[PDB]
Design a protein around this ligand. Sequence first.
Ligand SMILES: [Mg+2]
Ligand SMILES: [Mg+2]
Ligand SMILES: [Mg+2]
Ligand SMILES: [Mg+2]
Ligand SMILES: [Mg+2]
Lengths: 37, 175, 63, 171, 136
Amino acid sequence: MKVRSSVKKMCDNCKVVRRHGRVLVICSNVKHKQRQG
Amino acid sequence: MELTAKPRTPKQKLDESMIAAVAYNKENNVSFALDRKAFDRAFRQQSTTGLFDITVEGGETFPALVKAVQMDKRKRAPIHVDFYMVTYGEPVEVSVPVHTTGRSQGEVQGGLVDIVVHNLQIVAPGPRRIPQELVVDVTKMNIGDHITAGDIKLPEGCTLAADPELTVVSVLPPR
Amino acid sequence: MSYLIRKAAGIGKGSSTPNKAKVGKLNWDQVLEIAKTKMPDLNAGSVEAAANTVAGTARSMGV
Amino acid sequence: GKQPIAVPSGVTVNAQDGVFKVKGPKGELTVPYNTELTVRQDGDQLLVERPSDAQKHRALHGLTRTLVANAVKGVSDGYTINLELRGVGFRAKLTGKALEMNIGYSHPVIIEPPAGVTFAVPEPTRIDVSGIDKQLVGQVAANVRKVRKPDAYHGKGVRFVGEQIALKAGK
Amino acid sequence: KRTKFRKQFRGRMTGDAKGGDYVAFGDYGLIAMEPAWIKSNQIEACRIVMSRHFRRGGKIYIRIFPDKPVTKKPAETRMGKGKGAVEYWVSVVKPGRVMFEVAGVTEEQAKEAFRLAGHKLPIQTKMVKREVYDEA
RNA sequence: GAUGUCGGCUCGUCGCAUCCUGGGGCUGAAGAAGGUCCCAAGGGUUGGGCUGUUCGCCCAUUAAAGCGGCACGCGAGCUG
RNA sequence: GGAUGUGUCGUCGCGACAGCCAGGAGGUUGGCUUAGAGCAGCCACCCUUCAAAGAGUGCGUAAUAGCUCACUGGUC
Ligand SMILES: [Mg+2]
Ligand SMILES: [Mg+2]
Ligand SMILES: [Mg+2]
Ligand SMILES: [Mg+2]
Ligand SMILES: [Mg+2]
């Protein structure tokens, strides 16, 4: 889990998910788990 | 472009999608006021080397050619436009832009084709037959070759304006 | 087919820059034997199309 | 958007108030929804209409359409998730109706089903979670899987069917 | 980068854009949207970075030479006059001033170079396209 | 017509950018032992040599020997 | 700075699009650089068969392979 103020795509599997007031990104590649919180 | 109102108070223009402009030649200098979208779609095509029908509110079709366009800063949206009524034999000097067709024999070798001057003004465009574009042979160029205005084929019935030895296009060296 | 071209035109290696300095130049006759030896490896369908197949290889090689 | 809805004789849709009661041979199941979201059985099949066509209504449209289909299929045939026990020394027994874990841990982990869910062993090396409510069936089976998450080197623990779990490997 | 010879000192004042144009000496350009001070060093930042993304070409123009010397605080105190003659050069830049412009490359190849050379800048910028024909 | 100055001793309390204890994500995480990040201030956070020292170095250990504030806390409380 | 959070105006183009079943090149192991083939970097990005498969997207190995996409058909 990498907390980055600037969460952007890195491949063709990164999917931005808007949950409970938070910016998350799910992806087959676990190293691509970016989250602003 | 169905031109309509033409006052001096833009109060009935700025909030809405309208753009101020003026057309003249010599005899008549009536201020106008065309539409925003109408112009931002026409000018994209004919630019300043193509005339378009300008019918004022009431039934007055007046042929004119875009001259100079001031651009609002900080925004791409224009704010003022100048038109020039077409005379019929000799009217004004029109600027014609230079394009490029065919791959050069310099782009492959390693160099890259760079146009020194994009817009090239000429003398006596001749109404009814205004060159909307200009195709220049670039393939004959290699490494360091300079193609001035004295090498560009004429539209026909038109003359150059800039120095005959003014480099229009040049292939620069790599890196 | 590259090995055959390097023996026909007498190419030692090739060309790092086929855009500036090429290698050599051959004739269509040498192409005939190439499409005649590597038939099982070629689809191409009669005549020229096989002939134009090899041309594409020599073009990006320096011939 | 979703409009087709499979309705068969064995079910019983009751759009009474806010509580949409549904009866069946497998057992009666209750599924509550919204009031503004119109829904009824038109003729033979069932249709779910929506007042307004933006998002606040469409998001609930498919929502209800699916949940109702889940209650139907649940009272018609029923849901049964089939797990699997893969690894060395990994096995599971049964105590009356509660599933008994035994996977690497010193002490066996006892897992007791809630009210309406029942476990089944075919095998020492397979698990089968059966139930009525499609939500409960998953909610329960899940807990089972949480016990031992497939490790990225051998893929042990509990999985579905075949799970696709690629091995990272030591080495 | 730095001037070859000047007076030395200056002042400070920010009015609207004057001599900035939408397009020249190329096809694509990059324009600021906020007034600020663009340090010399920041320009090297942009130029070098765009040269990493462009192996060959050299079609990168920078017509915003810094012509504005700035003072600096040497240590402490305030019992003195002009302090720090030689610090850094800054080139003023107003919304609608073109800083950078490239050509020869495609569309994608240009959206990257300006992008990158945009994060270094103290201000926001946007990349534009042709359709301007004022004076020439 | 006065807001006693450094350090120490004494007595505490608070914040979280957590030194060690707990609960997680990822790993170039096999295991063990670590790295990094996120959550979390309940409690703990040793004894000595040199120096006024604050620091810091060193000895011997420890899960750990945290970083700041409170007038660089505290002299109508003590040392000087 | 970042994001399928919404409301309201605009600019490009399209039996789709997403999904699902099936297919995926033969030239080729392109030429070249190196201890050494869609995917380190130089260069190109040509031809053929076809209702059709771009010498090419990502992950991967010391290269290999393999898993897929762009492109085609079918079922709603
Ligand atoms: Mg006093
Ligand atoms: Mg915290
Ligand atoms: Mg370990
Ligand atoms: Mg002591
Ligand atoms: Mg004090």
